[PDB]
Amino acid sequence: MIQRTPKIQVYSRHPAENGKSNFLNCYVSGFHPSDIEVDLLKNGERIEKVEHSDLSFSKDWSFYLLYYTEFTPTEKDEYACRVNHVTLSQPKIVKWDRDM
Amino acid sequence: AFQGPTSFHVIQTSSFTNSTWAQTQGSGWLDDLQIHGWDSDSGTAIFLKPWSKGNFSDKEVAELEEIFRVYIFGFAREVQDFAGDFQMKYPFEIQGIAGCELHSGGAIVSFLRGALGGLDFLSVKNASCVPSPEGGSRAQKFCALIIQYQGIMETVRILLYETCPRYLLGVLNAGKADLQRQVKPEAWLSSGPSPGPGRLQLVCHVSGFYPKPVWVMWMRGEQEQQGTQLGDILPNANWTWYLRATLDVADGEAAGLSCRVKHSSLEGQDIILYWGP
Ligand SMILES: CCCCCCCCCCCCCCCCC(=O)O[C@H](COC(=O)CCCCCCCCCCCCCCC)COP(=O)(O)O[C@@H]1[C@H](O)[C@H](O)[C@@H](O)[C@H](O)[C@H]1O
Ligand SMILES: CCCCCCCCCCCCCCCCCCCCCC
Numbered sequence A: 001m002i003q004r005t006p007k008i009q010v011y012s013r014h015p016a017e018n019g020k021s022n023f024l025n026c027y028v029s030g031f032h033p034s035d036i037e038v039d040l041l042k043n044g045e046r047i048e049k050v051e052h053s054d055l056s057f058s059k060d061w062s063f064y065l066l067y068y069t070e071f072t073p074t075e076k077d078e079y080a081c082r083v084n085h086v087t088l089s090q091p092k093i094v095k096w097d098r099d100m
Numbered sequence B: 001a002f003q004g005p006t007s008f009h010v011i012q013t014s015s016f017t018n019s020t021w022a023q024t025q026g027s028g029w030l031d032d033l034q035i036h037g038w039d040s041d042s043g044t045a046i047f048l049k050p051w052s053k054g055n056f057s058d059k060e061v062a063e064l065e066e067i068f069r070v071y072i073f074g075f076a077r078e079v080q081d082f083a084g085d086f087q088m089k090y091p092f093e094i095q096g097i098a099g100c101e102l103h104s105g106g107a108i109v110s111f112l113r114g115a116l117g118g119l120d121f122l123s124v125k126n127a128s129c130v131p132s133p134e135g136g137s138r139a140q141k142f143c144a145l146i147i148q149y150q151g152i153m154e155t156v157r158i159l160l161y162e163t164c165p166r167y168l169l170g171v172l173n174a175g176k177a178d179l180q181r182q183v184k185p186e187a188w189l190s191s192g193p194s195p196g197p198g199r200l201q202l203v204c205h206v207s208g209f210y211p212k213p214v215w216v217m218w219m220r221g222e223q224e225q226q227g228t229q230l231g232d233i234l235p236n237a238n239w240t241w242y243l244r245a246t247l248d249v250a251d252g253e254a255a256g257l258s259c260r261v262k263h264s265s266l267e268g269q270d271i272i273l274y275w276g277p
């Protein structure tokens, strides 16, 4: 009965360009057990239409999932990814950094 | 002598919450590309691509579904039955992966691995149940036990050594157009979070490329920078990938540096982006 906290990575499919439509991605991985909850946020408000991949896992058996949604980056509007998992005493928020 | 995925496998994730509450999630894959989904309620597969059935007939696809459907139900059932006997503490998860792959030369090796609590539990070497060291007594007892079932063993053998190979060649061929396509990457530079006063972090982004293999490095002229730190190759839901290559550098040494990207779709024409003053 191991428990592995999820690694969370946020990124846009294309380089950020205010105005042009893009794709926001939240890849969470290396976690175990599989039960998990992910949300893509916009200024703290969980986005509604978000797609995600069916569960999968690596060779080391740790699970991973891709959560994404078509989106348009503006000069403002802070996007992030929120994760709940048995390893986190409280949700974890990883903001989307355009220059990272 | 071809690019793209060279293997197929189905995975299984069975979560047991209590003695009469278990759920199973499964899917079919070509390396990291998902081609089959599995709807648990209706024990039916979900074909994600037009060519997901490979060269198999609708009749044989339905036979395989039925097979996985009863296996999924029976697996859950037997786990719940032997749970106590095997001294199992709820909740617990069991994972499985089985498939086959085409090696250069034409040989196709099959495989099957099972895990309990996120650790190896068993695997199938040369048609036999090989307990894993992290499987403890449990693994030895399960393998020793399972091999006694003529039926399930014969089915695992057929699926693994006859059906899987035949299926693989059929989907690799049927999905050739998508699997062997070449999509050029797009690169861009950015300034990452400063590693400290006077320092700077150079970030090179490469995205939208396919197939997966790719080469990205920070250069100074023709001299590769050793400090180049690759990030994980991340997925884009459209069967393309994303990768970062960073370099921790001093404010003054930035100018002169560049990011070089090589990818099979570039046909020798590498992408070179230079850091500007
Ligand atoms: C879209 C196209 C599809 C692509 C296909 C590609 C295939 C790729 C690889 C798949 C590998 C499959 C592995 C698991 C399948 C196991 C399996 O099929 O056996 C199941 C047993 O059901 C049980 O009661 C469950 C008890 C729980 C016990 C199970 C434990 C798991 C195994 C342990 C590993 C150690 C063993 C090592 C041995 C090498 C189902 O048997 P079925 O009822 O179909 O009878 C069958 C069926 O009808 C078949 O067709 C007949 O031939 C057969 O005679 C009959 O019994
Ligand atoms: C038509 C194909 C679509 C995909 C359907 C996928 C459904 C499940 C496939 C079966 C999984 C194979 C792996 C078997 C290995 C697990 C045994 C582990 C036993 C350990 C017990 C402690």
Ligand SMILES: CCCCCCCCCCCC
Pocket: B078, B079, B082, B083, B086, B142, B145, B146, B149
């Ligand atoms: C980890 C404990 C699971 C025990 C599995 C035993 C399988 C018995 C064969 C099924 C009878 C049809």
